[PDB]
Amino acid sequence: SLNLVSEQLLAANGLKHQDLFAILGQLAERRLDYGDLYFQSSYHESWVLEDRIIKDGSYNIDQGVGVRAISGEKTGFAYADQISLLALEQSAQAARTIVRDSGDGKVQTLGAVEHSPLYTSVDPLQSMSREEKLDILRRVDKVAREADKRVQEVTASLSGVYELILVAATDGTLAADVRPLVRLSVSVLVEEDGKRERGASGGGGRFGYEFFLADLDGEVRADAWAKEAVRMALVNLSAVAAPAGTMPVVLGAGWPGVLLHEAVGHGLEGDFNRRGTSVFSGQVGELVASELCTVVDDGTMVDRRGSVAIDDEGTPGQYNVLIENGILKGYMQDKLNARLMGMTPTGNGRRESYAHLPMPRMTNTYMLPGKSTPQEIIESVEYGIYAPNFGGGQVDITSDKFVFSTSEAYLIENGKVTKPVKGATLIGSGIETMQQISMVGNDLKLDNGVGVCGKEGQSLPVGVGQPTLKVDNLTVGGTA
Amino acid sequence: ISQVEAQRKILEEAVSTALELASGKSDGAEVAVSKTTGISVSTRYGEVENVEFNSDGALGITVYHQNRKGSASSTDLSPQAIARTVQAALDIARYTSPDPCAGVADKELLAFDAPDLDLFHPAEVSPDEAIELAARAEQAALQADKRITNTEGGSFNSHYGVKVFGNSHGMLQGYCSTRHSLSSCVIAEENGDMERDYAYTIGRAMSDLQTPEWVGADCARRTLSRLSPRKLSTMKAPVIFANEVATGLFGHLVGAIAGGSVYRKSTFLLDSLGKQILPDWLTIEEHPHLLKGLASTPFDSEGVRTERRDIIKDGILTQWLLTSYSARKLGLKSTGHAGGIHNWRIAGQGLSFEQMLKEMGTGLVVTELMGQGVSAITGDYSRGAAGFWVENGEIQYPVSEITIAGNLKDMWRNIVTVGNDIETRSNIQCGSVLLPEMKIAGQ
Ligand code: NA
Ligand code: NA
Ligand SMILES: [Zn+2]
């Protein structure tokens, strides 16, 4: 990857290795712990089907360089939407003004090392023909409409990104990545006797569009997802008022792992903990979850949306155990916060683009499976909720309050799943909720490739996952 | 002033170049460009933390041929990059399907001679000057009370922008704007419970901002008020949406009356045009041409003129919020809402916040909401809340880890009053709002 990316980002823009030396040298005129240059080019395409036709398409291009100068707690940062020597010089000269004092100028020699490949370098935009891409959307439309007569509207979209990145730093880091990302989304509207509801499905990952035509449990994946959006819509159409108050909640496997993303994930990002602003600050070695819970953030999963072959600081993705048998083991880091905490980078230094600062961020966050069957978990509840699907969530990491909102949910009555109920926001304290996890299923899965995480205005692709699990007490925001 | 006039010339030329390149190969085209420049700084314990120099540029084009559309964008505005962008959009439009509602906005609706709304009030603020404002705000918060034990810092932002829009009916208009803001956010602790809150000031001119010391005082006040909350028991009670969240309560209306939602039948207000959906005394005024307004605009994102309208008049829904495409789907004309709404104003009904507490007597004041939890198609509402419990017309204690639930149709229709404590830093500006009952889920 490095030679191929270097040819596209550096050589093609009149830059050599020695220009990297010169610019890093300009930063190192000042008293800095670290400086870096981050180069990026990306290409985004989208296609949208609605009203049985190919309604829209887009093609979006960006490129640029971002330059950081860091001293202790401090960062100076400037960037440009072009890759050139002048853009690098102007950005370095602005960023380094963070400190006036002279430095010793002693940078480490630039030197790349190998990392495990986690996804193809084949451009997904060019690897499939335009009509074959549009046939995916046409097939989703046909299947969804054929699934039930009550289907009145279908919106199906395909998105693809191809991104090249290169990072060079004063600590000697020299690293590159080639990042594909595709997503298929489906939304359907159903109507019956004047009542309307919506349902959605989709997913993707770091590969080409052929994934959407591959097999999923004996059917074509795009077809299965088309049928899932309809099924979801019809459940919602039948749903009755959700109960209100504190009760047992059984969460399904996969995307309900939003629980972990909100309840512990953000709270374990090293920036909050270095500052002391997270409820988890200073709690390494303490019981922060039930003894049944092992939570990992894993940047190493081949082909997954949330994975990072390198992070945006050039650190290869890692399997990081955050909580082990309920005990807090550590935090997700970037280079800045790791230095200030006396810790090491973990492969969690991520930025939305060259025009944004990296910070500690999640990759794929999930709970390891346990011994219970999903059926045993459901049978243990006399009255509660079963929630196999969610929309999003949110967390206050200081007060340790989080929310997440159901997208498919049911009553459990006498150990059996019964009536579908309307969307409800669930709320709890993160630590207290994790300590209430009394059963952990043997059925781990991750989401289909749909996660978007927002922190400080920067949106990133992430994964979540878990087996089926039981939270003994959780507050359900129903009306009934 | 000269940097921005240099940019404005370049941007106008980029629009004209893109339109000319498109004109021979398309029946219509729309081009939008922008450039935003400025600084963003932060402080930690009164010392500089981050200094970020911002410079963002953008060109987007949409072309139409045989009622087929295609779009492309680039942050590179070189002639060769513009040519590639135009070609990319034209190539897409060869493969999309004909859609008769798609196209350049109607010529008769375009702001060919757009009004000057006085949005541009530049300041030469140096990074060191910016750091001092942020530090002053943060320090004022930190020194307020000994329970303030940590910080998320002070922040100052100052930016100027230029936007130009043109299309194939011959519109080419642009305008400049500025925005400055100052904030701080601190953490307080009591008996092992931490809470965080923030305060801010925002305006188009620096001389419209509150002082740093005001921001810090407000930050500390808000943060300390959060300490030692209770989790309420599950109940039905009246609810006041404090001004800062009441604006968002009316904000849910935007999605519900958007033309895109209406023509797709994906809104719970589909059959409500001309019906009384709010109290008969409540009017929502839209004021797109307010001088210096935070959401004032001389034209929408399709170049369509923006107009003074009463969206709700005496409780009655008077119109949808339409764009060119959704208007055409409904057999109507655009109302100038491409890119959203442009300053909503809802007058108070005479009561202060204190008087609203007394009127309510016993109930919940919500000051912060969390999560999504609002169904566009049904109006069902379920959000996480923090705020205060009120009894005897007096705040008793903060509350958190609760939800509030209902349905927007009922919530809006049965509003009791709206206060004179108007939130003035937002697009939608109103006071606090009293609802007679919601379901509070807790213990
Ligand atoms: Na490896
Ligand atoms: Na033409
Ligand atoms: Zn997140």
Author numbering:
A (entry chain A): 2 to 481
B (entry chain B): 8 to 450
Reproduce passages from the article.
Using a combination of biochemical and crystallographic methods we show that E. coli TldD and TldE interact to form a heterodimeric metalloprotease. TldD/E cleaves the N-terminal leader sequence from the modified MccB17 precursor peptide, to yield mature antibiotic, while it has no effect on the unmodified peptide. Both proteins are essential for the activity; however, only the TldD subunit forms a novel metal-containing active site within the hollow core of the heterodimer. Peptide substrates are bound in a sequence-independent manner through β sheet interactions with TldD and are likely cleaved via a thermolysin-type mechanism.
Wild-type TldD/E crystals were grown in the presence of the peptide angiotensin II, and customized angiotensin II variant where the central (Tyr-Ile) peptide bond is replaced with a non-cleavable methylene bond, to yield two co-crystal structures with clear density for peptides where the carboxyl group of the C-terminal residue acts as a ligand to the catalytic zinc ion. Using the standard nomenclature for protease active sites, these two ligands spanned subsites S4-S1 and S3-S1, respectively, occupying roughly half of the active site cleft.
